[PDB]
Design a protein around this ligand. Structure first.
Ligand code: ZTQ
Length: 435
Protein backbone atom coordinates (compact mmCIF):
# COMPACT_ATOMS: atom_id res chain seq x y z
CA UNK A 1 0.00 0.00 0.00
CA UNK A 2 2.90 2.37 0.87
CA UNK A 3 4.96 1.78 -2.35
CA UNK A 4 5.46 4.92 -4.50
CA UNK A 5 3.18 5.76 -7.53
CA UNK A 6 0.23 4.08 -5.74
CA UNK A 7 -3.12 5.62 -4.72
CA UNK A 8 -5.23 3.20 -2.66
CA UNK A 9 -8.92 3.78 -1.82
CA UNK A 10 -9.63 2.17 1.59
CA UNK A 11 -13.39 1.73 1.23
CA UNK A 12 -14.37 -0.53 4.16
CA UNK A 13 -18.04 0.19 5.23
CA UNK A 14 -18.91 2.93 7.84
CA UNK A 15 -17.84 1.78 11.33
CA UNK A 16 -15.46 -0.93 10.02
CA UNK A 17 -12.52 0.52 11.97
CA UNK A 18 -10.64 2.50 9.27
CA UNK A 19 -9.59 5.22 11.80
CA UNK A 20 -9.21 3.26 15.07
CA UNK A 21 -7.77 -0.02 13.75
CA UNK A 22 -6.30 0.37 10.23
CA UNK A 23 -4.85 3.91 10.52
CA UNK A 24 -2.44 3.12 13.49
CA UNK A 25 -1.08 0.03 11.61
CA UNK A 26 -0.46 2.16 8.45
CA UNK A 27 1.32 4.82 10.57
CA UNK A 28 3.57 2.24 12.32
CA UNK A 29 4.56 0.77 8.92
CA UNK A 30 5.23 4.30 7.52
CA UNK A 31 7.51 5.19 10.46
CA UNK A 32 9.34 1.75 10.07
CA UNK A 33 10.05 2.63 6.38
CA UNK A 34 11.10 6.26 7.11
CA UNK A 35 8.35 7.73 4.93
CA UNK A 36 7.65 11.44 5.65
CA UNK A 37 3.85 11.20 6.09
CA UNK A 38 0.88 13.56 6.31
CA UNK A 39 -2.50 12.57 7.87
CA UNK A 40 -5.43 14.89 6.89
CA UNK A 41 -8.46 15.18 9.23
CA UNK A 42 -11.70 16.85 7.93
CA UNK A 43 -12.34 18.78 11.22
CA UNK A 44 -10.71 19.57 14.60
CA UNK A 45 -13.18 17.09 16.23
CA UNK A 46 -11.79 14.27 14.03
CA UNK A 47 -8.20 15.50 14.67
CA UNK A 48 -8.83 15.04 18.45
CA UNK A 49 -10.30 11.54 17.91
CA UNK A 50 -7.23 10.61 15.82
CA UNK A 51 -4.90 11.61 18.64
CA UNK A 52 -6.75 9.06 20.85
CA UNK A 53 -6.40 6.27 18.21
CA UNK A 54 -2.71 7.11 17.62
CA UNK A 55 -1.79 7.74 21.31
CA UNK A 56 1.89 6.96 21.96
CA UNK A 57 2.92 7.05 18.28
CA UNK A 58 5.32 9.85 17.31
CA UNK A 59 2.95 12.22 15.40
CA UNK A 60 3.32 16.05 15.12
CA UNK A 61 -0.17 17.60 15.62
CA UNK A 62 -0.34 20.75 13.48
CA UNK A 63 -3.63 21.88 15.14
CA UNK A 64 -4.58 23.65 18.43
CA UNK A 65 -7.37 20.97 18.80
CA UNK A 66 -4.83 18.73 20.59
CA UNK A 67 -2.61 19.73 23.57
CA UNK A 68 0.54 17.55 23.18
CA UNK A 69 3.64 19.88 22.66
CA UNK A 70 5.90 17.45 20.51
CA UNK A 71 9.47 16.06 20.86
CA UNK A 72 10.69 17.36 17.48
CA UNK A 73 11.55 13.78 16.34
CA UNK A 74 8.28 13.10 14.48
CA UNK A 75 8.29 12.35 10.72
CA UNK A 76 4.43 12.03 10.62
CA UNK A 77 2.38 15.28 10.58
CA UNK A 78 -1.37 15.52 11.24
CA UNK A 79 -3.40 18.59 10.16
CA UNK A 80 -6.89 19.44 8.82
CA UNK A 81 -7.73 19.21 5.06
CA UNK A 82 -8.16 23.09 4.97
CA UNK A 83 -4.80 23.65 6.72
CA UNK A 84 -2.96 21.54 4.07
CA UNK A 85 -4.52 23.47 1.17
CA UNK A 86 -3.96 26.80 2.98
CA UNK A 87 -0.24 26.11 3.55
CA UNK A 88 0.19 25.03 -0.10
CA UNK A 89 -1.31 28.40 -1.23
CA UNK A 90 0.74 30.57 1.22
CA UNK A 91 4.52 31.33 0.88
CA UNK A 92 5.44 28.60 3.39
CA UNK A 93 7.23 25.45 2.15
CA UNK A 94 5.13 22.33 2.65
CA UNK A 95 7.27 19.12 2.65
CA UNK A 96 6.90 16.86 -0.41
CA UNK A 97 5.33 14.01 1.73
CA UNK A 98 6.21 10.44 0.60
CA UNK A 99 2.87 9.11 1.95
CA UNK A 100 -0.38 11.22 1.98
CA UNK A 101 -3.29 9.83 4.03
CA UNK A 102 -6.70 11.54 3.79
CA UNK A 103 -9.33 10.45 6.36
CA UNK A 104 -13.06 11.09 5.49
CA UNK A 105 -11.88 11.53 1.90
CA UNK A 106 -15.48 12.01 0.63
CA UNK A 107 -15.54 15.67 1.99
CA UNK A 108 -16.75 17.96 -0.80
CA UNK A 109 -15.65 21.39 0.55
CA UNK A 110 -13.40 23.19 -2.00
CA UNK A 111 -10.20 22.83 0.08
CA UNK A 112 -10.75 19.02 0.42
CA UNK A 113 -11.37 18.59 -3.39
CA UNK A 114 -8.22 20.71 -4.07
CA UNK A 115 -6.16 18.60 -1.58
CA UNK A 116 -7.26 15.34 -3.39
CA UNK A 117 -6.35 16.91 -6.75
CA UNK A 118 -2.89 17.97 -5.64
CA UNK A 119 -2.12 14.64 -3.92
CA UNK A 120 -3.46 12.44 -6.80
CA UNK A 121 -1.40 14.53 -9.30
CA UNK A 122 1.81 13.89 -7.25
CA UNK A 123 0.99 10.13 -7.24
CA UNK A 124 0.35 10.22 -11.05
CA UNK A 125 3.76 11.93 -11.51
CA UNK A 126 5.38 8.97 -9.64
CA UNK A 127 6.50 11.19 -6.72
CA UNK A 128 4.44 9.86 -3.82
CA UNK A 129 1.93 7.29 -2.48
CA UNK A 130 -1.56 8.12 -1.13
CA UNK A 131 -4.36 6.46 0.81
CA UNK A 132 -7.92 7.92 0.63
CA UNK A 133 -10.05 6.52 3.50
CA UNK A 134 -13.84 6.56 2.88
CA UNK A 135 -16.78 4.14 2.60
CA UNK A 136 -18.20 6.41 -0.16
CA UNK A 137 -15.63 7.36 -2.85
CA UNK A 138 -16.64 9.75 -5.68
CA UNK A 139 -19.34 8.35 -7.96
CA UNK A 140 -20.64 5.73 -5.49
CA UNK A 141 -24.18 4.63 -6.39
CA UNK A 142 -25.09 2.70 -3.20
CA UNK A 143 -26.92 4.71 -0.53
CA UNK A 144 -27.39 1.61 1.72
CA UNK A 145 -23.91 0.10 2.42
CA UNK A 146 -23.13 -2.59 5.03
CA UNK A 147 -23.10 -1.66 8.74
CA UNK A 148 -21.95 -3.21 12.07
CA UNK A 149 -25.53 -4.12 12.94
CA UNK A 150 -28.79 -4.32 10.92
CA UNK A 151 -30.63 -1.04 10.28
CA UNK A 152 -34.40 -0.58 9.73
CA UNK A 153 -34.61 1.52 6.52
CA UNK A 154 -38.00 3.31 6.02
CA UNK A 155 -39.04 5.74 3.26
CA UNK A 156 -41.38 8.30 4.92
CA UNK A 157 -42.47 11.97 4.47
CA UNK A 158 -40.14 14.02 6.73
CA UNK A 159 -41.13 17.53 7.93
CA UNK A 160 -39.05 20.48 6.62
CA UNK A 161 -41.15 23.12 8.50
CA UNK A 162 -42.82 23.35 11.94
CA UNK A 163 -45.84 21.01 12.17
CA UNK A 164 -48.98 20.77 14.34
CA UNK A 165 -50.04 17.21 13.29
CA UNK A 166 -49.37 14.27 10.92
CA UNK A 167 -45.87 13.26 12.13
CA UNK A 168 -46.50 11.59 15.52
CA UNK A 169 -43.65 9.04 14.89
CA UNK A 170 -41.12 11.91 15.13
CA UNK A 171 -41.93 12.82 18.76
CA UNK A 172 -43.30 9.48 20.03
CA UNK A 173 -39.73 8.00 19.97
CA UNK A 174 -37.85 7.51 23.30
CA UNK A 175 -34.25 7.26 22.02
CA UNK A 176 -31.81 9.84 20.63
CA UNK A 177 -32.19 11.08 17.01
CA UNK A 178 -29.77 12.75 14.59
CA UNK A 179 -31.72 14.77 11.99
CA UNK A 180 -30.09 16.03 8.77
CA UNK A 181 -31.60 19.25 7.36
CA UNK A 182 -30.72 21.15 4.16
CA UNK A 183 -29.79 24.47 5.78
CA UNK A 184 -29.15 26.30 9.07
CA UNK A 185 -32.41 28.32 8.61
CA UNK A 186 -34.45 25.12 8.05
CA UNK A 187 -32.87 23.54 11.15
CA UNK A 188 -33.75 26.64 13.25
CA UNK A 189 -37.48 26.18 12.44
CA UNK A 190 -37.48 22.41 13.16
CA UNK A 191 -35.49 22.95 16.40
CA UNK A 192 -37.97 25.59 17.64
CA UNK A 193 -40.90 23.22 16.90
CA UNK A 194 -39.22 20.31 18.80
CA UNK A 195 -38.25 22.64 21.71
CA UNK A 196 -41.90 23.84 22.00
CA UNK A 197 -42.89 20.11 22.19
CA UNK A 198 -40.59 19.60 25.24
CA UNK A 199 -37.52 18.14 23.45
CA UNK A 200 -33.86 19.01 24.20
CA UNK A 201 -32.21 20.00 20.94
CA UNK A 202 -28.58 20.70 19.93
CA UNK A 203 -27.96 22.37 16.53
CA UNK A 204 -24.76 21.81 14.48
CA UNK A 205 -23.41 23.62 11.42
CA UNK A 206 -19.92 24.45 9.97
CA UNK A 207 -19.41 27.67 11.97
CA UNK A 208 -20.53 26.24 15.33
CA UNK A 209 -19.39 22.59 14.90
CA UNK A 210 -16.55 22.23 17.52
CA UNK A 211 -18.28 24.11 20.34
CA UNK A 212 -21.75 22.63 19.84
CA UNK A 213 -20.48 19.07 19.13
CA UNK A 214 -18.97 19.07 22.68
CA UNK A 215 -22.55 19.52 24.04
CA UNK A 216 -23.48 16.13 22.53
CA UNK A 217 -21.02 14.50 25.02
CA UNK A 218 -21.48 16.92 28.02
CA UNK A 219 -25.30 17.06 28.30
CA UNK A 220 -28.46 15.00 27.81
CA UNK A 221 -30.24 15.56 24.53
CA UNK A 222 -33.15 14.15 22.57
CA UNK A 223 -32.35 15.52 19.08
CA UNK A 224 -29.28 16.74 17.20
CA UNK A 225 -30.35 18.95 14.20
CA UNK A 226 -27.43 19.19 11.76
CA UNK A 227 -26.45 20.26 8.28
CA UNK A 228 -24.30 17.96 6.00
CA UNK A 229 -21.11 18.73 8.10
CA UNK A 230 -21.99 15.75 10.35
CA UNK A 231 -21.37 13.42 7.31
CA UNK A 232 -17.60 13.93 8.01
CA UNK A 233 -16.96 11.34 10.72
CA UNK A 234 -18.97 12.94 13.54
CA UNK A 235 -20.23 10.15 15.82
CA UNK A 236 -23.20 10.09 18.18
CA UNK A 237 -24.70 7.68 20.70
CA UNK A 238 -28.04 7.59 18.88
CA UNK A 239 -30.59 4.96 17.73
CA UNK A 240 -32.25 6.88 14.89
CA UNK A 241 -31.33 9.07 11.97
CA UNK A 242 -34.04 11.24 10.33
CA UNK A 243 -32.84 12.29 6.89
CA UNK A 244 -34.59 14.97 4.80
CA UNK A 245 -32.38 13.64 1.90
CA UNK A 246 -31.93 17.30 0.84
CA UNK A 247 -29.13 19.83 0.58
CA UNK A 248 -28.43 23.29 -0.93
CA UNK A 249 -26.29 23.53 -4.06
CA UNK A 250 -24.17 26.64 -4.77
CA UNK A 251 -24.52 27.44 -8.51
CA UNK A 252 -22.64 30.10 -10.48
CA UNK A 253 -25.10 31.86 -12.89
CA UNK A 254 -23.65 33.39 -16.10
CA UNK A 255 -20.22 33.49 -14.43
CA UNK A 256 -21.35 36.60 -12.45
CA UNK A 257 -23.34 35.59 -9.31
CA UNK A 258 -23.70 32.62 -6.99
CA UNK A 259 -27.12 31.43 -5.80
CA UNK A 260 -27.96 28.65 -3.29
CA UNK A 261 -30.26 26.44 -5.41
CA UNK A 262 -32.69 24.00 -3.91
CA UNK A 263 -33.15 22.35 -1.48
CA UNK A 264 -32.56 19.42 -3.84
CA UNK A 265 -31.65 15.69 -3.50
CA UNK A 266 -28.37 14.69 -1.84
CA UNK A 267 -25.83 12.38 -3.61
CA UNK A 268 -25.80 8.60 -2.85
CA UNK A 269 -22.47 9.18 -0.99
CA UNK A 270 -24.09 11.83 1.30
CA UNK A 271 -27.13 9.60 1.95
CA UNK A 272 -24.90 6.62 2.86
CA UNK A 273 -22.86 8.85 5.24
CA UNK A 274 -26.02 10.30 6.90
CA UNK A 275 -27.39 6.77 7.38
CA UNK A 276 -23.90 5.59 8.47
CA UNK A 277 -24.23 7.59 11.76
CA UNK A 278 -26.32 4.63 13.13
CA UNK A 279 -26.04 0.81 12.99
CA UNK A 280 -22.46 1.26 14.34
CA UNK A 281 -22.75 -0.93 17.45
CA UNK A 282 -22.78 -4.71 16.68
CA UNK A 283 -24.59 -5.31 20.00
CA UNK A 284 -27.52 -2.94 19.29
CA UNK A 285 -29.36 -4.04 16.17
CA UNK A 286 -32.49 -2.21 15.03
CA UNK A 287 -31.28 1.41 14.77
CA UNK A 288 -33.70 3.28 12.46
CA UNK A 289 -33.04 5.27 9.29
CA UNK A 290 -36.10 7.32 8.16
CA UNK A 291 -35.55 8.99 4.79
CA UNK A 292 -37.70 11.61 3.00
CA UNK A 293 -36.68 11.60 -0.65
CA UNK A 294 -34.49 10.01 -3.32
CA UNK A 295 -30.81 10.58 -4.33
CA UNK A 296 -29.47 12.36 -7.40
CA UNK A 297 -26.02 13.35 -8.65
CA UNK A 298 -26.30 16.97 -7.52
CA UNK A 299 -22.48 17.46 -7.32
CA UNK A 300 -22.46 17.87 -11.14
CA UNK A 301 -22.15 21.64 -11.81
CA UNK A 302 -21.90 22.39 -8.07
CA UNK A 303 -19.71 25.53 -7.42
CA UNK A 304 -17.32 23.69 -5.05
CA UNK A 305 -15.59 21.87 -7.95
CA UNK A 306 -15.09 25.15 -9.89
CA UNK A 307 -13.78 26.75 -6.59
CA UNK A 308 -11.35 23.75 -6.20
CA UNK A 309 -10.00 24.57 -9.71
CA UNK A 310 -9.50 28.23 -8.63
CA UNK A 311 -7.38 27.00 -5.63
CA UNK A 312 -5.35 24.43 -7.71
CA UNK A 313 -4.58 26.98 -10.45
CA UNK A 314 -2.88 29.08 -7.74
CA UNK A 315 -0.76 26.33 -6.09
CA UNK A 316 2.84 25.80 -7.29
CA UNK A 317 3.48 22.21 -8.45
CA UNK A 318 6.47 22.27 -10.89
CA UNK A 319 7.35 25.19 -13.27
CA UNK A 320 4.05 26.10 -15.09
CA UNK A 321 2.36 22.72 -14.44
CA UNK A 322 -0.95 22.73 -12.59
CA UNK A 323 -2.55 19.90 -10.62
CA UNK A 324 -5.64 18.21 -12.08
CA UNK A 325 -8.72 17.23 -10.05
CA UNK A 326 -8.76 13.60 -8.79
CA UNK A 327 -9.93 11.59 -11.85
CA UNK A 328 -13.32 10.22 -10.51
CA UNK A 329 -14.52 13.77 -9.67
CA UNK A 330 -12.97 15.67 -12.61
CA UNK A 331 -16.18 15.71 -14.76
CA UNK A 332 -18.15 17.59 -12.06
CA UNK A 333 -16.92 20.91 -13.50
CA UNK A 334 -16.43 22.26 -17.04
CA UNK A 335 -13.08 24.03 -16.58
CA UNK A 336 -9.76 24.53 -18.31
CA UNK A 337 -6.69 23.93 -16.11
CA UNK A 338 -4.90 27.25 -15.62
CA UNK A 339 -7.83 29.60 -16.49
CA UNK A 340 -7.84 30.98 -12.89
CA UNK A 341 -4.04 31.41 -12.53
CA UNK A 342 -3.33 34.84 -10.99
CA UNK A 343 -0.19 37.03 -11.07
CA UNK A 344 1.79 37.30 -7.78
CA UNK A 345 0.09 40.44 -6.25
CA UNK A 346 -3.46 39.37 -7.23
CA UNK A 347 -2.74 35.82 -5.89
CA UNK A 348 -1.68 37.26 -2.50
CA UNK A 349 -4.96 39.32 -2.37
CA UNK A 350 -6.99 36.14 -3.28
CA UNK A 351 -5.35 34.19 -0.47
CA UNK A 352 -5.83 37.02 2.10
CA UNK A 353 -9.56 37.51 1.15
CA UNK A 354 -10.04 33.79 2.02
CA UNK A 355 -7.72 33.43 5.05
CA UNK A 356 -8.43 36.77 6.83
CA UNK A 357 -11.55 37.96 4.92
CA UNK A 358 -13.34 34.59 5.34
CA UNK A 359 -14.97 35.10 1.91
CA UNK A 360 -16.12 32.15 -0.27
CA UNK A 361 -13.47 31.08 -2.85
CA UNK A 362 -15.53 32.30 -5.86
CA UNK A 363 -16.11 35.78 -4.36
CA UNK A 364 -12.43 36.13 -3.26
CA UNK A 365 -11.41 35.29 -6.87
CA UNK A 366 -13.77 37.93 -8.41
CA UNK A 367 -12.35 40.67 -6.14
CA UNK A 368 -8.64 39.74 -6.58
CA UNK A 369 -8.91 39.21 -10.37
CA UNK A 370 -10.50 42.68 -10.72
CA UNK A 371 -7.23 44.23 -9.39
CA UNK A 372 -8.75 45.34 -6.04
CA UNK A 373 -6.47 45.27 -2.91
CA UNK A 374 -7.48 43.44 0.27
CA UNK A 375 -8.47 46.51 2.37
CA UNK A 376 -10.41 48.28 -0.44
CA UNK A 377 -14.14 47.66 0.29
CA UNK A 378 -15.75 50.08 -2.18
CA UNK A 379 -16.98 47.05 -4.19
CA UNK A 380 -19.31 46.05 -1.24
CA UNK A 381 -21.57 49.08 -2.06
CA UNK A 382 -21.43 49.76 -5.84
CA UNK A 383 -23.34 46.83 -7.31
CA UNK A 384 -26.72 46.99 -9.10
CA UNK A 385 -30.06 47.37 -7.23
CA UNK A 386 -30.78 43.62 -7.70
CA UNK A 387 -27.56 42.85 -5.64
CA UNK A 388 -29.00 44.59 -2.50
CA UNK A 389 -28.64 42.27 0.49
CA UNK A 390 -31.79 42.02 2.63
CA UNK A 391 -31.99 41.61 6.43
CA UNK A 392 -35.47 40.87 7.93
CA UNK A 393 -37.25 42.14 4.72
CA UNK A 394 -35.37 45.51 4.61
CA UNK A 395 -31.95 46.34 2.94
CA UNK A 396 -28.95 45.61 5.18
CA UNK A 397 -26.99 48.75 6.12
CA UNK A 398 -23.51 49.31 7.52
CA UNK A 399 -21.30 52.27 8.44
CA UNK A 400 -18.36 52.29 6.03
CA UNK A 401 -14.76 52.70 7.25
CA UNK A 402 -15.28 56.41 6.17
CA UNK A 403 -18.16 56.88 8.68
CA UNK A 404 -20.94 56.90 6.02
CA UNK A 405 -24.14 54.79 6.44
CA UNK A 406 -24.67 52.77 3.22
CA UNK A 407 -26.84 49.98 1.86
CA UNK A 408 -24.95 46.71 1.38
CA UNK A 409 -25.02 46.10 -2.40
CA UNK A 410 -21.94 44.12 -3.50
CA UNK A 411 -20.64 44.34 -7.08
CA UNK A 412 -20.63 40.45 -7.14
CA UNK A 413 -23.38 38.72 -5.18
CA UNK A 414 -22.55 35.37 -3.58
CA UNK A 415 -25.58 34.02 -1.64
CA UNK A 416 -23.24 32.31 0.86
CA UNK A 417 -22.38 35.69 2.50
CA UNK A 418 -26.00 36.05 3.71
CA UNK A 419 -27.28 32.39 3.93
CA UNK A 420 -28.05 32.84 7.67
CA UNK A 421 -27.84 35.59 10.35
CA UNK A 422 -24.24 34.64 11.38
CA UNK A 423 -22.90 34.77 7.80
CA UNK A 424 -24.54 38.19 7.09
CA UNK A 425 -23.18 39.55 10.43
CA UNK A 426 -19.61 38.50 9.37
CA UNK A 427 -20.04 40.00 5.87
CA UNK A 428 -21.35 43.32 7.37
CA UNK A 429 -18.18 43.44 9.53
CA UNK A 430 -16.07 42.83 6.39
CA UNK A 431 -17.85 45.53 4.34
CA UNK A 432 -17.28 47.98 7.26
CA UNK A 433 -13.47 47.34 7.17
CA UNK A 434 -13.44 45.58 10.56
CA UNK A 435 -11.08 42.76 9.40
C1 ZTQ B 1 -4.06 27.50 15.01
C2 ZTQ B 1 -3.71 26.07 14.64
O1 ZTQ B 1 -2.77 26.15 13.57
C3 ZTQ B 1 -1.55 25.52 13.65
C4 ZTQ B 1 -0.86 25.39 12.46
C5 ZTQ B 1 0.40 24.82 12.44
C6 ZTQ B 1 1.00 24.35 13.61
C7 ZTQ B 1 2.34 23.72 13.58
C8 ZTQ B 1 2.78 22.89 14.60
C9 ZTQ B 1 4.03 22.30 14.55
C10 ZTQ B 1 4.88 22.56 13.50
C11 ZTQ B 1 4.47 23.39 12.48
C12 ZTQ B 1 3.23 24.00 12.54
C13 ZTQ B 1 0.27 24.45 14.80
C14 ZTQ B 1 -0.99 25.04 14.83
C15 ZTQ B 1 -4.95 25.42 14.07
O2 ZTQ B 1 -5.17 25.60 12.84
O3 ZTQ B 1 -5.65 24.74 14.84
Amino acid sequence: MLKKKQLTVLDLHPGAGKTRRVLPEIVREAIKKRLRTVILAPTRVVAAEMEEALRGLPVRYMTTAVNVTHSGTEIVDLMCHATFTSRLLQPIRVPNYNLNIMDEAHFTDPSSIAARGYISTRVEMGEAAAIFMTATPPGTRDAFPDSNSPIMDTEVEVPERAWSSGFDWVTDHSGKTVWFVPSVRNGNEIAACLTKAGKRVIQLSRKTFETEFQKTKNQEWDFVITTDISEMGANFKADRVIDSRRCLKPVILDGERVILAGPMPVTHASAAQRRGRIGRNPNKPGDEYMYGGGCAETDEGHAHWLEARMLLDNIYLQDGLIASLYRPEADKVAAIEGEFKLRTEQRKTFVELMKRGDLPVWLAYQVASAGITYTDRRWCFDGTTNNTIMEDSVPAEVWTKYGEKRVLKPRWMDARVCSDHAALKSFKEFAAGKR
